Amino acid sequence: LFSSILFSIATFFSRILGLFRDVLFAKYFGVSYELDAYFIAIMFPFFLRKVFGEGAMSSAFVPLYSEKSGEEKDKFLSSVINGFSLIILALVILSYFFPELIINLFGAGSSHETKILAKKLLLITSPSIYFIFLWAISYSILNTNNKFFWPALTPSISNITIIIGTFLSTKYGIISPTIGFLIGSILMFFSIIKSIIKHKYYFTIKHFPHFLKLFFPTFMTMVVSQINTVVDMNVVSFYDKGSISYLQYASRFYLLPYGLFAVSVSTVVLSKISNDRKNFNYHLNDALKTTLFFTIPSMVGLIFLSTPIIRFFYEHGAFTSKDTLITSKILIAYTLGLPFYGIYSTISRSYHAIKNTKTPFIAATIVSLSNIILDIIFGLKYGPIGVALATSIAGIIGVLYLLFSVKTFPIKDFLKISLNSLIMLFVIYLTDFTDNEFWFLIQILIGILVYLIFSSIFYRDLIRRF
Ligand SMILES: [Cl-]
Ligand SMILES: [Cl-]
Ligand SMILES: [Cl-]
Ligand code: NA
Ligand SMILES: [Zn+2]
């Protein structure tokens, strides 16, 4: 629909801007115990943000808010706000009085100086949760009114404040981007405060229990799917200092091709399932093909060009050649799972599309359990790269479960796409001559052209018919 395209525009801007935030992190801080500390401090809010944000709450909030009429709707809203305010307040109190609990939750293995600094920053990040939660509620209200572009854009506020703090980091140090994180949350809330403050306030949580009853199922899938990144970070804290920062650089960069190829391309087609349930198996079939068509070649390219890509974006200022080597290898480790997490995401969102919460949940559980196990075994011994690989392998396991669940997969088109991807690989390999920092961009363009040529050869009849 119109709102999906608009949503992609808003999200695209916010994520590219986010990338610039990370790039400046590499420039001004590189890999350091202090950036580790900053990451630990912001993880708790960010964990909460990612869980609730981008309309996660909406799924349960929309039906219960929109249905009500009169000032019972206003009462409902106030009930939710008050309830969450209670939980949040408890959290912030606990944070201030037992910061070692929070620190150990996210960075148990980090060094002494890192933990001290992370406490200091925690004092600044803790209040952000309240504003993030209010931002999430406000967001939902907007979704009831079918406004999607501007809410989707608000994350850019946070990115700009953090960026600015990074620019001021040469004057104030690590605390500047932390205060920027805080202020960023505040301005994100104020940007859409009107959706909340127009209604009246009632001193009650009367409807909060019902809201929790309905919300809980979507909450559990968000927690389980997200908890993995917390586990990854926690585990790598036990490796040499700077590991958290390595993993954050690699994963934040990795989230661009994942978000673009493993999720976004499959959105449009997936919409059909919601409107045409009777043909789910057929529609799902198509979706999978779409996913593969993008994820398999990308992976190849990303792996073949991981080092030059990483060097182009990150190797400035404090970020050093050693950091490029290490981060590039981590990025490969994540990228090996790209097609598997694409398939995973497609099947999961389709099941969600036919009102099935059980299977996506179970798959999430398998992936999370596997990732914790493999993070222990491989992460502790082999550090960041081991953690990333654990994530990818876990993805493979989840894919096997889901594939045995839906009992359908486009084998023929998988083979054709893999073949075209290896032709592409062969051509880009042959063209690896100049060894110039800017050469990889050309190599991507060449690769795209090769891949589309041979795809058009192997899909001639499909292009003609359509
Ligand atoms: Cl950040
Ligand atoms: Cl209710
Ligand atoms: Cl009710
Ligand atoms: Na992992
Ligand atoms: Zn109620």
Author numbering: 4 to 469
Original paper wording:
The cytoplasmic-facing Lipid II is flipped to the periplasmic side of the membrane by a Lipid II flippase, after which the GlcNAc-MurNAc-pentapeptide moiety is incorporated into peptidoglycan and the lipid carrier is recycled. MurJ consists of 14 transmembrane helices (TMs), of which the first 12 are organized into two 6-TM bundles termed the N-lobe (TMs 1–6) and C-lobe (TMs 7–12). The N-lobe and C-lobe enclose a central cavity that is large and highly cationic, properties consistent with Lipid II transport. We determined four crystal structures of MurJTA: one structure in an outward-facing conformation to 1.8 Å resolution, and three structures in inward-facing conformations distinct from the published structure, resolved to 3.2, 3.0, and 2.6 Å, respectively.
Based on the conformation at these regions and the size of the membrane portal, we assigned two of the structures as inward-closed and inward-open. The Cα-Cα distance between Ser11 (TM 1) and Ser267 (TM 8) increased from 8.0 Å in the closed structure to 17.4 Å in the open structure. Superposition of all the inward-facing structures show that they align well at the periplasmic end of the protein, which highlights the importance of the periplasmic gate in stabilizing the inward-facing state. We observed systematic rearrangement of Arg24, Asp25, and Arg255 (Arg270 in MurJEC) in the cavity between the different crystal structures. In light of this discovery, we re-analyzed the Na+ site in all our other MurJ structures and found electron density in the inward-occluded and inward-closed structures as well, albeit much weaker. Because of the high concentration of Na+ in the crystal drop outweighing the potentially lower Na+ affinity in the inward-facing state, we posit that these weak densities would correspond to Na+, possibly reflecting the inward-facing pre-Na+-release conformation of MurJ.
